[PDB]
Ligand binder design. Sequence first.
Ligand code: HEM
Ligand SMILES: CCCCc1nc(Cl)c(CO)n1Cc1ccc(-c2ccccc2-c2nn[nH]n2)cc1
Ligand SMILES: CCCCc1nc(Cl)c(CO)n1Cc1ccc(-c2ccccc2-c2nn[nH]n2)cc1
Ligand SMILES: OC[C@H]1O[C@](O)(CO)[C@@H](O)[C@@H]1O
Ligand SMILES: [K+]
Length: 463
Amino acid sequence: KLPPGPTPLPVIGNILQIGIKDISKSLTNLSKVYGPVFTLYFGLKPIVVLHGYEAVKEALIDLGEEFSGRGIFPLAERANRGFGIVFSNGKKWKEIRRFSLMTLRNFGMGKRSIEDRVQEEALCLVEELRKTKASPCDPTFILGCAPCNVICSIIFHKRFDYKDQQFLNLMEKLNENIKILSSPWIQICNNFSPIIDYFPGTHNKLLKNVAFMKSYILEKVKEHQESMDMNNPQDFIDCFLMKMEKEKHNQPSEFTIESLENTAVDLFGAGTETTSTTLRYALLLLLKHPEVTAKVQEEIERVIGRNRSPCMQDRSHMPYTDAVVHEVQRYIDLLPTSLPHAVTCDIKFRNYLIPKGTTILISLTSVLHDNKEFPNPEMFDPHHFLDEGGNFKKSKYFMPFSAGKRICVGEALAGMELFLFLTSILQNFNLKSLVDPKNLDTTPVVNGFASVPPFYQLCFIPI
Ligand code: HEM
Ligand SMILES: CCCCc1nc(Cl)c(CO)n1Cc1ccc(-c2ccccc2-c2nn[nH]n2)cc1
Ligand SMILES: CCCCc1nc(Cl)c(CO)n1Cc1ccc(-c2ccccc2-c2nn[nH]n2)cc1
Ligand SMILES: OC[C@H]1O[C@](O)(CO)[C@@H](O)[C@@H]1O
Ligand SMILES: [K+]
C-alpha cells in the first residue's frame, strides 16, 4: 500500500483540497489528520509527503540513496532544466554533482580561494553601500549583485564591476527568469497539463534568456581554451575542461561543453536569488530587532575591529553572530518544501511500499519550525541557536539547505557569503528604518512554494 491520504476525486485527485496559496500550511494541516507520512494525488500522480523531523531524517538521511532522485514535472522539459545538477538524475547527476562539490571546495580551484573571492565581493558591496550616501534605499538590487558576482568569479575567474553592461544583462535575465519561475501559473497550474503547454510564450522567453546566458558562457569557454594552463586551473570552467580532457578516452561522457553550459546556468540559478533574498531578509530582521544588531556589532568590534576584513576564521569566535545568521535562515524558511524528490527504486518505507519514481515532497518548514526544538518557532529569536552560557548550540533540525544526498551544493559557499557580507555591512554601517521599527512587518509573504520578505527601505549610516 501507499501511505494513506485524503481520498482523491476522479481526474483532479486532491488538487481542489490543497491551498495552492500556502502549500506548506496545507501540508501541515493534512499532517494533523493523516500523520507524518501521507499521499496526495496531483491529478493521478501520487505524491508522498514527509512531515516532521523523524520522517524526513529517516528518508533523506537513513535511506538516502533511495530518496536521492529529483521529482520531474512537465516544467522540467518545458524550460529545459534536466541537464545540469539541480534537475538531473542517475549517472549524469552523480557525476556532475561529485565534480561540482570537488571544484567548489574552498581551494578546489587553484590558489585563489573561494573565501578570497567572497572577501573581495564584500569590499565592493560595502563601497556601493557608501555611494548611497545614507539616503533611503531599497537594498534589493545591491544585495542581489554581490552573490551574482561571486558566481561570476567562481565560473569565469574574475568578478565584474557593478556597472559593466555585460553583468547588468546577465543579472537582468536571471531576475526575469526567476520572477517568471516564481509564478504559480508556471510552477503549479501549467504542470496540471501533462502534455499541452498552456504558456508557450512564457517558456519561449525563459529559453531565450537562458540562451543569452549560455552564449555568453560559450564566449568565455573559448577564451579559456586559448589560455589554458593545465597546471593552473583558476575557475570552474578550467576545472571542467580539465575533466573533459581526462575523459576523452571514455565517450560518451557526462562532461561535454553542453553539460558545462547547463551546469553553469544551474549555479547562477541556484546561487543568486536564495542568497540575495536571505541577505535582504536578514537586514529587515536586523532593522526590526536593533538590540540584535548591536550584539553582533559588539562581537564584530571585539573580535575583528576596523583594520581588516572579516574572515571565516572569525566565525568560531562569534557565536552570537553565528546564531543570528542561523536564525535568519530558520525563521524565513525560503524553500518550505525544498525541491521535490523521487525514490530511485521500489522501497518499503515504514509499513508502506512506495514504488520507484514516486514523487516525494519534503516539508522543511516542519523541521525548521519544530515547536519543541525551537520553542516559539514563529518568532525570530537568536537564542534558538544559543545555550544558557551564550555559546553556539547546533541543531540537527537546521535544514534550510535540505539534507542527505541532495543537500544544497552551495551550503558552505552560502555560509561564507552570509557571514562575510553581514559582518562586513555591520562593521561599516548602522541601519536606520524610514518607518517606525514597531511598524515594520517581518512576516513572510508566501505565494506557492516560495517565501519572500515584504518591501522595505532603509539607510546605511556610516560608522
Ligand atoms: C541561502 C542560500 C541557499 C539556500 C537556502 C539553498 C537551498 C537549497 C535547497 C533547499 C536545495 C534543494 C535540495 C534538495 O533537493 O533537497 C538546493 C539545491 C541546490 N543548491 Fe542551493 N541554496 C542556497 C544557495 C546556493 C548557492 C550559493 C549555490 C551555489 C553553488 C547553490 C547551489 C545549489 C545546487 C546546485 C543545488 C542542487 C543540488 C542537487 O539537486 O543535487 N545553492 N539549495
Ligand atoms: C509566443 C512566443 C513569443 C515568446 C516571447 N519571447 C519574449 Cl522575449 C516575449 C516577451 O513577452 N515573448 C512573448 C510572451 C507573450 C505572453 C507571455 C505571458 C505573460 C503573462 C501571462 C501569460 C503569458 C502567456 N505565455 N504564453 N501565452 N500566454 C509571456 C511572453
Ligand atoms: C538566465 C538563466 C536563469 C536561470 C534559469 N532560467 C531557467 Cl528557465 C533555468 C532552468 O533550470 N534556470 C536555471 C535554474 C536552476 C535552478 C533554479 C533553482 C535552484 C535551487 C532552488 C529553486 C530553483 C528554482 N526553480 N524554479 N525557480 N527557482 C532556478 C533557475
Ligand atoms: O502520471 C499521471 C499524470 O497525470 C497528471 O497529473 C495530469 O494531472 C500528470 O501531472 C501526471 O504525469
Ligand atoms: K502568446
